[PDB]
Design a protein around this ligand. Structure first.
Ligand SMILES: OC[C@H]1O[C@@H](O[C@H]2[C@H](O)[C@@H](O)[C@H](O)O[C@@H]2CO)[C@H](O)[C@@H](O)[C@@H]1O
Ligand SMILES: [Ca+2]
Length: 629
């Protein structure tokens, strides 16, 4: 029997759960897939409200796990896993084993440089540049009996809004698509949405392929998928809690545990340098594990031929603290129920847990906020790490890993999403490393929460950085990073971030006994319930400062290249964001937004992001469980 829960907060979770699952609210598609947001005019990471992400799926799992905890019904949790496997993990038809089985572990992929401006793309492939070897593929094919990868592709056009369809049919839904392909300066506003399955039926003469990669020969028809490691790890984290909660009530989610475990086994591809180069000695091809940084990097990607048989797999050299999940690492390396089938699965995750905790500590600023991360590929071309750039296992520090428009570590959300996982680990194990990190981080953020007399509140929104951490010496440990500082640029009322903050503070307060953290968590939860509730969950009005880019952001198209989007929009040099997404003019909020831009005003919106609503619901359940009285 599960322990008693605080009835007040349990009721708030149930109310939110009902609002999120209410078909009249429109959070899900007819196929049962949650959208990024109810509203369609949405550009921030995905560029359309009704595309979904693996991130949304992992929140859907967490939400359903918590619901099973309170209702004793776990069929919704099992359903979230069925939808994920059916629509987000490429099937046999999507990643033909005929091509995947032709993968060569001694030559995983062909090197191509990364550039700091989208105008330098397509990037030319170079077969003469060294590529290390993949030590885990043989472990995976042996344990699972297939060459296909079991991980979630990160973004999905749920209703086929772009019109690419399934496997080039232009008519089916959902539709696998990808966006980001052109480096750190390619914001969400500067991409050319493309299909994952490219048969050359849309776009230009060779589909969209030669917009990104240049080869000596003619581009072949091919598929390609990209994983978002933080989402796959959150799926493991959510499944662990569903397994614990189910077992307390004599129920079982055995089948979902096996999928989560298999996913965590493949998730190890993110522990490796993009082209399997040695960590700390980027000019040399790796010989196996010497190319493993053991951190959850920006992505792992894979693809292969459609009409000819071949394939490739890449990891990522860039690491952001925001993606780490020491809790998922603890689960996969110590819990017998989640022991991966592969030979080195559990032990690699045990190595990741230690390395992740070292990474967080190395990045902790003088004040307490966690700085960006590190890369094993300077400028994405394995260049020499400049002057006295501090390093972590030979990897140079980067303030904003991967993206600079805007900087990936300028959003406060990374702080809470990542530290929440550290709080869960500390709660479960009492780990000293987790405690040291949290004691300092919590003290910082507790001094940044502002409560107003009218019930509203504000938390850090945009942050900035100065300096760099001291070079990591594993034996000396934390130096205090006196020359690394965080600065809060502006405050706001991001409800998803505040909910994630409440969650982190709740786990931390339950273990440490820190009253300040417990009352700030409850006050955040109460303030949101009382002052921001609406018929769809919670919401507030926010300014969309970058929406002017809808009309004035030019998209780079290489000289001489012309193509068409499925709806007929012409892709050619000179196009703006809106020119290759003309369907946006039919959005119900379009006139309102343009009218605001015309009047010289910053557009505002009241948004219902699926992850934020789920984050709030989960935060209430966590508090109900940890603080019953
Ligand atoms: O890319 C991180 C994360 O961003 C989320 O959107 C943020 C956006 O980055 C920020 O500029 C704006 O102020 O707030 C929104 C909402 O928090 C996005 O919703 C996530 O899917 C994405 O992973
Ligand atoms: Ca840019």
């Amino acid at each position: 029997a599960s322990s008693p829960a605080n009835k007040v907060y349990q009721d708030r979770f149930e109310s939110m759960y009902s609002k999120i699952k209410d078909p009249a609210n429109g959070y899900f598609s007819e196929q049962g897939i949650p959208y990024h947001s109810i509203e369609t005019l949405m550009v921030e990471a995905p560029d359309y409200g009704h595309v979904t992400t693996s991130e949304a799926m992992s929140y859907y799992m967490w939400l359903e796990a918590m619901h099973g905890r309170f209702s004793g019904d776990f069929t919704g949790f099992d359903k979230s896993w069925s939808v994920t496997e059916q629509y987000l993990i490429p099937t046999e038809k999507d990643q033909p084993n005929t091509s995947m089985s032709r993968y060569d572990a001694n030559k995983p992929a062909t090197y191509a440089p990364e550039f700091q401006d989208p105008s330098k793309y397509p990037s030319p492939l170079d077969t003469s540049q060294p590529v290390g070897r993949d030590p885990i593929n043989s472990q995976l094919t042996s344990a699972y009996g297939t060459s296909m990868l079991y991980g979630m592709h990160w973004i999905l056009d749920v209703d086929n809004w772009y019109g690419f369809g399934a496997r080039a049919d232009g008519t089916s839904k959902p539709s696998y698509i990808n966006t980001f392909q052109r480096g750190e300066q390619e914001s969400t506003w500067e991409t050319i949405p493309q299909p994952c399955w490219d048969e050359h039926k849309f776009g230009g003469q060779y589909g969209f392929l030669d917009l990104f990669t240049k080869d000596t020969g003619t581009p072949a028809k091919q598929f390609k998928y990209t994983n978002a490691p933080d989402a796959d790890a959150r799926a493991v984290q959510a499944t662990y809690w569903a397994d614990q909660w189910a077992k307390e009530q004599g129920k079982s989610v055995s089948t979902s545990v096996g999928k989560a475990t298999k996913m965590g086994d493949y998730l190890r591809y993110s522990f490796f340098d993009k082209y399997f180069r040695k960590i700390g000695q980027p000019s040399q091809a790796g010989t196996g594990y010497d190319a493993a940084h053991y951190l959850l990097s920006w992505y792992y990607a894979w693809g292969g031929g459609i009409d000819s048989t071949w394939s490739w797999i890449i990891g990522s050299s860039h690491n952001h603290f925001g993606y780490q999940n020491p809790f998922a690492a603890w689960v996969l390396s110590t819990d017998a129920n989640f022991k991966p089938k592969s030979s080195n699965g559990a032990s690699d995750w045990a190595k990741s847990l230690d390395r992740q905790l070292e990474f967080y500590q190395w990045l902790q600023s003088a004040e307490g906020a966690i700085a960006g991360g590190a890369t094993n590929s300077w400028n994405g071309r394995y260049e020499a790490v400049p002057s006295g750039t501090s390093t972590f296992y030979g990897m140079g520090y980067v303030e904003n890993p991967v993206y600079a428009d805007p900087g990936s570590n300028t959003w406060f959300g990374m702080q809470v999403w990542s530290m929440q996982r550290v709080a869960e680990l500390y709660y479960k194990t009492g780990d000293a490393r987790a405690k040291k990190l949290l004691d300092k981080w919590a003290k910082w953020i507790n001094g940044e929460i502002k409560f107003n007399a009218d019930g509203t509140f504000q938390i850090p929104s945009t942050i900035d950085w100065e300096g760099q951490p001291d070079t990591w010496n594993p034996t000396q440990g934390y130096t205090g990073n006196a020359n690394l500082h965080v600065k809060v640029v502006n405050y706001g009322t991001d409800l998803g971030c505040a909910s994630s903050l409440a969650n982190t503070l709740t786990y931390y307060a339950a273990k440490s006994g820190d009253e300040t953290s417990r009352q700030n968590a409850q006050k955040l939860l109460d303030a949101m319930w009382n002052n921001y509730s609406d018929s769809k969950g919670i919401s507030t009005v926010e300014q969309r400062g970058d929406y002017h880019r809808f009309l004035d952001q030019e998209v780079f198209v290489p000289a001489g290249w012309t193509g068409k989007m499925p709806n007929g929009d012409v892709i050619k040099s000179g196009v703006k964001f809106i020119d290759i997404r003309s369907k946006y003019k039919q959005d119900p909020e379009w006139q309102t937004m343009v009218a605001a831009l015309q009047a010289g005003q910053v557009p505002t919106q009241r948004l219902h992001r699926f992850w934020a609503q789920s984050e709030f619901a989960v935060a209430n359940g966590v508090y109900a469980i940890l603080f019953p009285d």
